[PDB]
Amino acid sequence: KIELTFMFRGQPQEQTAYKNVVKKFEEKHPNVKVNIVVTSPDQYATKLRAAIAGRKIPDVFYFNPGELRAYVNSNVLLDITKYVENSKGVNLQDIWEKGVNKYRFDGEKVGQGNLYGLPKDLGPFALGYNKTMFEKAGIPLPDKDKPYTWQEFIDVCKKLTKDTNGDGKLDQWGTGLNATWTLQGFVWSNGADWIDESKTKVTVDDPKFIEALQFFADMQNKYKVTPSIAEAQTLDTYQRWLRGQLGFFPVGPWDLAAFDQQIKFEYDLIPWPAGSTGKPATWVGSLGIGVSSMTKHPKEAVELALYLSADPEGQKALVDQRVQLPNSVKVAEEWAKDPSIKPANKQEFLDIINDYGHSFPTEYTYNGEWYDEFYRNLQPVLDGKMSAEEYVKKAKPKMQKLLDQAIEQEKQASK
Ligand SMILES: OC[C@@H]1O[C@@H](OC[C@@H]2O[C@@H](OC[C@@H]3O[C@@H](OC[C@@H]4O[C@@H](OC[C@@H]5O[C@@H](OC[C@@H]6O[C@@H](O)[C@H](O)[C@H]6O)[C@H](O)[C@H]5O)[C@H](O)[C@H]4O)[C@H](O)[C@H]3O)[C@H](O)[C@H]2O)[C@H](O)[C@H]1O
Ligand SMILES: [Ca+2]
Incomplete structure (x- = not known):
């Protein structure tokens, strides 16, 4: 029928x-x-x-x-x-x-x-680390509860960054985060956000936002705990993570199937590193x-x-x-406590949902064109061809217009 x-x-x-x-x-x-x-x-x-x-x-x-x-x-x-x-x-x-x-x-x-x-x-977006390379390197494992500071995070990423098959070429990197999905945590942790409390003003030129944005880009370009631009171009960091080349990388629960199938090293979850606020931050989708x-x-x-x-x-x-x-909350609670089911600190996911996870900015706005505009021309900042300060100054009025228009369209479509 x-x-x-x-x-x-x-x-x-x-x-x-x-x-x-x-x-x-x-x-x-x-x-x-x-x-x-x-x-x-x-x-x-x-x-x-x-x-x-x-x-x-x-x-x-x-x-x-x-x-x-x-x-x-x-x-x-x-x-x-x-x-x-x-x-x-x-x-x-x-x-x-x-x-x-x-x-x-x-x-x-x-x-x-x-x-x-x-x-x-x-979908809590947790941070994952490769337990296998950490141990092989002799580096103390991350704290399950106590997040790395940014400095501490960079330090360990550096130690994880090396040429391991002795051919003279780096073949392993601390990390390789994708700005689209992992810049929020640093912004939010640094006490900033894309928009203000009222969700009507663009705040990407807040010095705290700029600092977090600059720190993100610097880990490829300056700290170099990342594969190079060209290397990322050859094989993206998601894939390099799956192959066992990266110390850290995010993990959503939608990853677990793919990771079961492809990842051969042992890995576990930790809080994201914390900016000025002392508190970890990430999104829950x-x-x-x-x-x-x-x-x-x-x-x-x-x-x-x-x-x-x-x-x-x-x-x-x-x-x-x-x-x-x-x-179901109760089911997930007994799911998170079951040791037969990897990763070990599954509990971190729930922790993100209950405590330190946030919503995307566009969840508060009538449409998200204003936010999409931030990411549309962001790649030159990520590749070091201009600073975080000068992109956000240039791009903020563009995205304030779009936000104003979105607020106006919600007045008009709702009366
Ligand atoms: O590093 C630079 C970049 O690399 C190159 O791109 C490579 C990328 O790697 C591959 O992607 C790996 C996946 O990306 C991350 O997952 C992020 C997204 O989540 C998945 O969907 C899950 C879904 O979303 C959750 O809700 C999120 C939001 O919340 C709402 O507000 C809104 O509606 C949602 O959007 C839900 O809870 C959940 O069900 C998507 O599949 C994925 O995009 C993880 O790391 C991996 O899963 C892929 O090949 C490339 O995208 C580029 O050159 C450069 O950008
Ligand atoms: Ca090598």
């Missing part, structure tokens, strides 16, 4: 995981058929915006929490409050509250009110699972979303397949 379109994004391992779980779902609901539309993480936002622009919207789909408000105003998302209430036994309250609450909207704020999506997951407000099959569509987001047996298969941590 019922056919359903499901679009989402994922790295190869994530795609395989969700397809198997949709197949479990179909077995449990033999009158529902799910046609899948899946993309790479990169190509995803463009395709969804084209589907929405043409009002050819999938029954069920992934979406950015920072688009909730705009999606609601434009009538993109079905209000699913009652379909989830009347579901069998499902207890959304067992799910992470910061997760579920990203997809609530009472007409004026995102804190409370009706449900317009379910959280796919929470999330994607929403929403339902087309114009789906012909709201009941069944909500049923597919619930199965992926909260259903005990649907959650279980996704965690088994190592592409996320459990959405």
Whole structure:
């Protein structure tokens, strides 16, 4: 009888995981058929915006929490409050509250009110270290609790940076962080942010922001605890991490499957290094699972979303397949305490969610074009061809205009 379109994004391992779980779902609901539309993480936002622009919207789909408000105003998302209430036994309250609450909207704020999506997951971005090269080097292991200072972090990265096969060429580096996904921690840890408290002013020219930005770039260009620009060009640092060439690199729970398959060294999680604030910082990501407000099959569509987001047996298969941590708080707590399941300090993930993880800036803004503009022309700063001070001075009014326009578009689309 019922056919359903499901679009989402994922790295190869994530795609395989969700397809198997949709197949479990179909077995449990033999009158529902799910046609899948899946993309790479990169190509995803463009395709969804084209589907929405043409009002050819999938029954069920992934979406950015920072688009909730705009999606609601434009009538993109079905209000699913009652379909989830009347579901069998499902207890959304067992799910992470910061997760579920990203997809609530009472007409004026995102804190409370009706449900317009379910959280796919929470994605704490932890720091990982290669325990195998640390030991082989004779370097004391990092503290599981007490974060490196920036200076300390650079020191160890230096000791980890060397020519190990004695051919005269460096073949191992302390680290190689990707600014797109790892600059936030340093900014936030240094007491800065992309925007102010009100979330209406751009603050990337705060001296604290500049200092963190400069420190990030300097680890490739000045401290040289990084493969060179050319070397990174030859093989990106993600890949070099997988190959065992890097001391440190981030780890999200969506990595665990890929890492099971490729990483041969022992590795574990630690807090991110801390800037002036003394406190570690990093992000906790999330994607929403929403339902087309114009789906012909709201009941069944909500049923597919619930199965992926909260259903005990649907959650279980996704965690088994190592592409996320459990959405149920209590389950994740016993998951984090289970020693048979690597890495050892899985607990760090939860620590990031409860204590020292933050949201992306765009989650507070009506759209994120202002933020995308910061990263669009950032590469010359990363490659040392201009300072952090002069890029952010040049780029701040560009991104204040975009932010002003986003605030204006939310007045206009919501009245
Ligand atoms: O070093 C310079 C760069 O290297 C070259 O690019 C190489 C890159 O390496 C490969 O990427 C490795 C992955 O990247 C990191 O993961 C970051 C992103 O997370 C994954 O999705 C998980 C998903 O996101 C979470 O939520 C995040 C946000 O929160 C919301 O506000 C918003 O909606 C979300 O965006 C969810 O919790 C979770 O489910 C993506 O797959 C990944 O991009 C990890 O280190 C690895 O997973 C890849 O080949 C290249 O991108 C370039 O030359 C240079 O830029
Ligand atoms: Ca060498």
